[PDB]
Amino acid sequence: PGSIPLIGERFPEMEVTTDHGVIKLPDHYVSQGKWFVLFSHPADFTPVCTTEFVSFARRYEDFQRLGVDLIGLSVDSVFSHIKWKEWIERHIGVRIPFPIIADPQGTVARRLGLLHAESATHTVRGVFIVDARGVIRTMLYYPMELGRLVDEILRIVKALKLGDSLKRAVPADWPNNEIIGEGLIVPPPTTEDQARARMESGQYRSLDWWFCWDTPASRDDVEEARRYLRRAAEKPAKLLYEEA
Amino acid sequence: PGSIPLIGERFPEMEVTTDHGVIKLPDHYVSQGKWFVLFSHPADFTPVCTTEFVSFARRYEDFQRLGVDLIGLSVDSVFSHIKWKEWIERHIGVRIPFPIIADPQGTVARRLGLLHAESATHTVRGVFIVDARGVIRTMLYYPMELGRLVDEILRIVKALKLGDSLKRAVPADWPNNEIIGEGLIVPPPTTEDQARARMESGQYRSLDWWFCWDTPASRDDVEEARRYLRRAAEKPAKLLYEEA
Amino acid sequence: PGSIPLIGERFPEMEVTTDHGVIKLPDHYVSQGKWFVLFSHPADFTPVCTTEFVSFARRYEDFQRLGVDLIGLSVDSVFSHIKWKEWIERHIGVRIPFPIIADPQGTVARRLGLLHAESATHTVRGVFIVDARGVIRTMLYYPMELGRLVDEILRIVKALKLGDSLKRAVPADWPNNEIIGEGLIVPPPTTEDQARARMESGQYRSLDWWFCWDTPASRDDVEEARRYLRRAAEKPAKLLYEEA
Amino acid sequence: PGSIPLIGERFPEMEVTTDHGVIKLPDHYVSQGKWFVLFSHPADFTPVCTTEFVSFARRYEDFQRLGVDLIGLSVDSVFSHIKWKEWIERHIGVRIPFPIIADPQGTVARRLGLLHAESATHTVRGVFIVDARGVIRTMLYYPMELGRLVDEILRIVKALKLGDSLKRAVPADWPNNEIIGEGLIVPPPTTEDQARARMESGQYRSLDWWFCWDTPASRDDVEEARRYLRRAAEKPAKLLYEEA
Amino acid sequence: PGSIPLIGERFPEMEVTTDHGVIKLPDHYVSQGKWFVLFSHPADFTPVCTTEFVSFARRYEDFQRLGVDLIGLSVDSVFSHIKWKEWIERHIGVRIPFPIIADPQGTVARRLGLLHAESATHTVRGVFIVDARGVIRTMLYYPMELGRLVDEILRIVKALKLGDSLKRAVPADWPNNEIIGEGLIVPPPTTEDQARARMESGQYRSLDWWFCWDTPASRDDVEEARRYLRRAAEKPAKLLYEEA
Amino acid sequence: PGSIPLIGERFPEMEVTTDHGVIKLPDHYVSQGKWFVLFSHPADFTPVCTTEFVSFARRYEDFQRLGVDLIGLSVDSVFSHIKWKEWIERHIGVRIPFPIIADPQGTVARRLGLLHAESATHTVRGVFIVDARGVIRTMLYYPMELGRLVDEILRIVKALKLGDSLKRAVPADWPNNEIIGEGLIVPPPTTEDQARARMESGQYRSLDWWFCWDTPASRDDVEEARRYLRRAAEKPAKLLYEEA
Amino acid sequence: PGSIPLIGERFPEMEVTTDHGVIKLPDHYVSQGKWFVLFSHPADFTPVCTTEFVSFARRYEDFQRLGVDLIGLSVDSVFSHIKWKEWIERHIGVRIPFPIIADPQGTVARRLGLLHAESATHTVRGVFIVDARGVIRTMLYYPMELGRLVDEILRIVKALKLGDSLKRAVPADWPNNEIIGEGLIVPPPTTEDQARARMESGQYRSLDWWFCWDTPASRDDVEEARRYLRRAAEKPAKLLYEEA
Amino acid sequence: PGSIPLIGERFPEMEVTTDHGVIKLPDHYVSQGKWFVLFSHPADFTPVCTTEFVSFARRYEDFQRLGVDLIGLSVDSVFSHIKWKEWIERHIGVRIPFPIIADPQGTVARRLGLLHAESATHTVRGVFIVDARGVIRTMLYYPMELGRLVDEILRIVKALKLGDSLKRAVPADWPNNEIIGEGLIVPPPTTEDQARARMESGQYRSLDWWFCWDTPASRDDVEEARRYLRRAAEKPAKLLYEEA
Secondary structure (H helix, E strand, O other), X not given: OEEEOOOOOEOOOEEEEXXXXXXXXXXXXXXXXXXXXXXXXXXXXOHHHHXXXXXXXXXXXXXXXXXXXXXXXXXXXXXXXXXXXXXXXHHOOOOOOOOEEEOOOOHHHHHHOOOOOOOOOOOOEEEEEEXXXXXXXEEEEEOOOEOOOHHXXXXXXXXXXXXXXXXXXXXXXXOOEOOXXXXXXXXXXXXXXXXXXXXXXXXXXXXXXXXXXXXOOOHXXXXXXXHHHXXXXXXXXXOXXXXX | OEEEOOOOOEOOOEEEEEEOEEEEEOHHHHOOOOEEEEEEOOOOOOHHHHHHHHHHHHOHHHHHHOOEEXXXXXXXXXXXXXXXXXXHHXXXXXXXXXXXXXXXXXHHHHHHOOOOOOOOOOOOEEEEEEOOOOEEEEEEEEOOOEOOOHHHHHXXXXXXXXXXXXXXXXXXXXXXXXXXXXXXXXXXXXXXHHHHHHHHHOOOEEEEOOEEEEOOOOHHHHHHHHHHHHHHHOOOOOOHHHHO | OEEEOOXXXXXXXXXXXXXXXXXXXXHHHHXXXXXXXXXXXXOOOOHHHHXXXXXXXXOHHHXXXXXXXXXXXXXXOHHHXXXXXXXXXXXXXXXXXXXXXXXXXXHHHHHXXXXXXXXXXXXXXXXXXXXXXXXXXXXXXXXXXXXXXXXXXXXXXHHHHHHXXXXXXXXXXXXXXXXXXXXXXXXXXXXXXXXXHHHHHOOOEEEEOOEEEEOOOOHHHHHHHHHHHHHHHOOOOOOHHHHO | OEEEOOOOOEOOOEEEEEEOEEEEEOHHHHOOOOEEEEEOOOOOOOHHHHHHHXXXXXXXXXXXXXXXXXXXXXXXXXXXXXXXXXXXXXXXXXXXXXOEEEOOOOHHHHHHOOOOOOOOOOOOXXXXXXXXXXXXXXXXXXXXXXXXXXXXXXXXXXXXXXXXXHOOEEOOOOOOEOOOEOOXXXXXXXXXXXXXXXXXXXXXXXXXXXXXXXXXXOHHHHHHHHHHHHHHHOXXXXXXXXXX | OEEXXXXXXXXXXXXEEEXXXXXXXXXXXXXXXXXXXXXXXXXXXXXXXXXXXXXXXXXXXXXXXXXXXXXXXXXXXXXXXXXXXXXXXXXXXXXXXXXXXXXXXXXXHHHOOOOOOOOOOOOOEEEEEEOOOOEEEEEEEEOOOEOOOHHHHHHHHHXXXXXXXXXXXXXXXXXXXXXXXXXXXXXXXXXHHHHHHHHHHOOOEEEEOOEEEEOOOOHHHHHHHHHHHHHHHOOOOXXXXXXX | OEEEOOOOOEOOOEEEEEEOEEEEEOHHHXXXXXXXXXXXXXXOOOHHHHHHHHHHHHHHHHHHHOOEEEEEEEOOOHHHHHHHHHXXXXXHOOOOOOOEEEOOOOHHHHHHOOOOOOOOOOOOEEEEEEOOOXXXXXXXXXXXXXXXXXXXXXXXHHHHHHHHHHOOEEOOOOOOEOOOEOOEEEOOOOOHHHHHHHHHHOOOEEEXXXXXXXXXXXXXXXXXXXXXXXXXXXXXXXXXXXXX | OEEEOOOOOEOOOEEEEEEOEEEEEOHXXXXXOOEEEEEEOOOOOOHHHHHHHHXXXXXXXXXXXXXXXXXXEXXXXXXXXXHHHHHHHHHOOOOXXXXXXXXXXXHHHHHHOOOOOXXXXXXXXXXXXXXXXXXXXXXXXXXXXXXOOHHHHHHHHHHHHHHHHHOOEEOOOOOOEOOOEOOEEOOOOOOHHHHHHHHHHOOOEEEEOOEEEEOOOOHHHHHXXXXXXHHHHOOOOOOHHHHO | OEEEOOOOOEOOOEEEEEEOEEEEEOHHHHOOOOEEEEEOOOOXXXXXXXXXXXXXXXXXXXXXXXXXXXXXXXXXXXXXXXXXXXXXXXXXXXXXXOOEEEOOOOHHHHHOOOOOOOOOOOOOEEEEEEOOOOEEEEEEEEOOOEOOOHHHHHHHHHHHHHHHHHOOEEOOOOOOEOOOEOOEEOOOOOOHHHHHHHHHHOOOEEEEOOXXXXXXXXXXXXXXXXXXXXXXXXXXXXXXXXXX
């Protein structure tokens, strides 16, 4: 019952209005070599969305350090967006530094498959991870009642960038995979003789010709990804509500 | 470029062949009062998929504890399913206990929008979380080169179940949200009169009339959810590859 | 070019969400035997719109006295609507007492033809005047750059009601028409025998058989109407910006 | 429902016969650097129409002073037009100086959406305000039983011309707005940086970053606009029915 | 019903993924001057299919000696294909030396009409014999429950190459036809003058003008064809299940 | 390409004219509890087709013994069929006992997909093996220049009937399969528990859980199947063109 | 109903296979400056067709004297055609010397409208008379149960060649017409002036302006045409079956 | 290029206007148990047509003795028909006793395929022979320039009637066939058994099993048919133009 962009496709080319100005996607980021996370939320001045924006805002320099920009999206106007950002800066003490797309009318939402059956009016919490070639790498659709785990989005982009750069695939649960730890997977042979050569070379640890891996990620890349997960798992000492 | 079922919709009724036999979905689970997680993977005997199956299998009791069943899917035949399961039991030491649908041909995959642009032949790594009423609550689409974080799937279903029984929306990163920690959000008033009565009642902690929260989840519930994130953030003591 | 409801047609039956609750139009007002003025504005937190809401809000008793209710509309959500009404009340000292419809995808706006070419995203400043039977009696489309004259909406309503209750047409600029002042027009004869009988009747003041009038409105109806124009023409004693 | 040209669109191009000749719209007026107000009325030798034509003829010079021309329209033929103008001139003593379109087949009225459900055969009292670029700036649809307030069409064109030349939006009830009086609105910033800069400059009177205004209009322009309202509110010292 | 390519058409051009690598069909073999037999099986790790691969494997050299390559096809992935090859080599002791196309999704199978009504998901046991021009010369469709007689496929290939080169048609059951034995048939005259001339040449053994034959095939070519049948008819002494 | 009926479908219902009378297929044979082999030939009085009629006529008793009726088909008329059958009887000494459908116009041939690309005018040499329920069980398309090996049609029929009554699949080259000889195959388990069950029962000879077999066919059934192959391999003792 | 080529149209350009080789109609004959009679018969080895072939073969020289060739047509193959010609030459003693098109599939028959109700499989007995410009001059459709009168086809071609060369129309039953004998008709005048000039020219015998005739055909041409009817009317002195 | 009814179809049901009154056709004749010959001519007052109508009129008795009625057809009106029949009676001395259809407009003509390429306005010389069941049995299309041989039409109806009643096919130019004279053909056997029974019934003279014949027509029938041919061949001793 809905149409969406797909992984592996180029992000739909579109000019959008954001509270930082009009920008062209995915070009604005591709031209800078940036990946970007475009995420949507149902409405400004709604609570789960406010928690998610504060959580992205607090992790903004983690994204910037990976070369990833952030961009939000909802059916509200840019006026609402600014007003909501001022409310947030004023009452929660957190400045939201990235743009939010305003698409009253839902043109962008439809194009991205963000209006689901829970609401005909507001988008769900989708998240698109797009690489520096403009290519959709991952898509997540959370519902209106459940905020996202923003550290898993950091883990996803960190792991995709690493995989791309090291030409490896990433095991489930990685930095902490139960079979190979922080090891990374060598893409499986796709021919018989490549399989045979890989087993002949003895270059990797392997469980079978289609299951070879090594540990080429730097200790800093592994620690950084593990740090996102430890952050997700750690209860903050001091809530910003108290502070407010 | 791809059509998908949507959150809030009933899972597409269908009969599917799994390596445990034919089952009708969502009925097989709805009749039992159970939720289910249907997840797909590109291919039997490929490594990220094997790490993911092991991760789901080792967390199977956690899904059972929540009344959630797991069912996998790929375009391989039930015979490859069975031989791949044997190989995992034999070389990694873990038995996969749940069914895998086999859809050579991609009939099921196409109905669920699991074939993306990354591969014309194998599905991406999608995940549908479906409640005991047959309704899709969340959908995730990870790519072929990156395993999922199974603990977040546990966190999602645990949080959706809590929000459903307590009538509360769940903040970003719950139960470690940075604004209200493990608090849960009272869905926002949608009318002025409702906004005013809520501020007047004084029955919730509040940042504004649209941001009210309280802490109705039991310590057990919060800690179970935080325990999934802690496990994810924890480096394994010993790797299954070593003991194998 | 756009499609719109027409004068003489029953307002399009629709359920809408406003910041006072879901109501069905035109039923909600017809059921109360109330005429209503539905008006739209491009966006909450935008200045001309704010001046129009305060102007409508300050003339609300004048619409109540007629039996007319007011309802606004923009593509913003109800949450923005309530925050915006809180802002006006806090900074301008005027409470907006009527509902505002939230139409974030333009559904209502498309039905009413409120999306013009000045903006693909925000509605123009439309006004539909609807009588207690649900019929569209007048439609005005002002642009985004120009605020309405709310006293001319009162004059319209007052005159339509008077014309309906006295079976009279209302001359240009009534009750200060330059030919007949506060006189009201007798619907012209449509047959030759009616035209003849009207002339032999000697009952109205008349310029020709198709141009007869009298003065059946009461001094109250006449001075009420003129009072709206006198208020429009008057320089405000004190501006709301000074005590703001 | 019916279809209508929209604010912001070029006025439909079409040749039209008027009782001054054939002309091409909007070209005739665009060619002359003129804005024009095209208005319709249901029928020649009908009383409310005759009052409106008299009211427009009386204010014609006020329209010309603004660089604005008037053109009528009804389904009558040019012969009826000329006969009706003679009749007005003879019995009311007013010469109607501007052209009226004769549109016997409803071709023009259907391009303009002027046939509503109140009559299948005669147009409502529609008003297009078209600027010198041939672009529709405002559309009012009065019904057949209610004559228009011609001073409000002069205020709208004067306000539109002023806001275009001063780059300002016009508040409700200008020049007598209740919040800022004859103050004009600076169109709102649409990005955070613009908002910040607007407020940092301290160059405008302001209630919020999206609500700034100043008083750039000439004392003569404001007085003229107020004069249209004072005239509208003032009862004529003597009625034309009295000499006639 | 279903759509199939046809004898005498060019084998459908297609790039195909095999367990030896991506190859382009007709072309890969056409470019080397080789014929190829493309055959399909419903599923790796299924018993009839295994017997067929082992039977093709055992006759590999017979097809290589005729210049004919072998290529398999199923809807399984290349990873299943290679594990199944490994399983056959390991438990039967036979190495399958030719490629198998992996067609999950059934794209190649739809194009060759290999999906019949006996299974909506797996291919029947098709067989396409394609000459060095890339032309389909014979198509056989066995069902899932019945293994092929591979020696009849070598007889088909051998006979087709012999007839192409001797410019002869081949009688039923050649080289053991009950009427003419290892005789080969001269294509019948299609005109009266040719029939008459043929009958006058006295050059062929003949039963009638449209039934002439001779014995152009060499004794080694005859014996080779007969050796395939003798092999098909001989009970193997020593079954590979016992040996294994 | 061309359309064909598929294995597993009910043979297309049709009334056909044969040189034995009009009959309705498949009903005519189903109502007698008989399977039938329907084969086509390009043209009466052409040599390969003559050799194929004589070979089928010679095996007629072998086909009837299997419960199988033979039916031919070509685009010729029934009068050609009868003259050709007299010619065969008179010059070769063999009486053809089964009917031949006459399909001038090629209506039956287009339904069966018997018109391929090497002749726009005559059918290829197709073979449909139809069981006693009217179901197409195998389809073979031989080209015009190569006659069929009729003993392999007998082997096919025989093995299909044996597999149907013993509920067994037939290995490649049966009764002389190189791995299991005249054993037959138990259809593989399709579920994990069915596989474990099979393997735990100890009831079949086995190479793996999906490769079990046994020797359930009678000595006479196996020897009959082997006789067809011995015959195909044996050079006839006296050629029929000799006595003739 | 069925569709046919029409008199006055060029015969359908087509390439056809005849038992004398392939030819292109109408070109093969137009190139030679010959007319041709194409006629069809239902089926070789059928009695009425055999008698028609014989009658056409016995009159072959009469067609060649006129520069007319003959080609026949049925849906049988060139092989049937040749075997049937042999039968006729051997049992009746008559060699059929002209080509027969073989049209299995009925492609030529359908373009010529030769498949009528009566038989869905064999053509009717049609005849096209086609002149040396390739134009269809006459068409006759006899049925399957009634042989044609070949002498009337000779009369038709003779009469047409005569009317073409002498520019005359031919009366009914010519050369034995009961009103003007072997007289030939001048095409009637089509204007009043032409009528008047014709009658006053005194150049033709005449019954009225529209019925003028003379006798320009040579006694030879008249006698030759009457001789075909005398032959038709003549009882044969010896029957071919007696010496046959 | 043209659509015509076919032999073996029921003549198209149609109400036609004739100069004898309106009748309904196939019915009006079928009602009487009569066959009919409907023939067309291009135009009244045209010469070949007149000679054909005279030729039919002189043979009317012969057709009536056979139970055959005649009906003409052209695009002229019934007034032209009656006038032309008067001219014929008056100038030729022959009364035309049968109806002629008038189809100005050509509705009947298009339905019978009578408008060929030779003329877009007047029909060709069509002849339909329709039996007492209303079935079209023979169709002839002669062109404008060539009148028909009416004795051949008698010969066809007599032969078709004899063939129907004696259950025989009629040889080429019967009563004078060169092979069998006035012999009539037995419809060929269509099955092998029927052929063999034929050859053993010994009831008929025979050249082969598909060529048997009888002499069942009485001498009177044979002679009446031969008389139609003798009359065609005979030049009339005195021409009607003579006494005209």
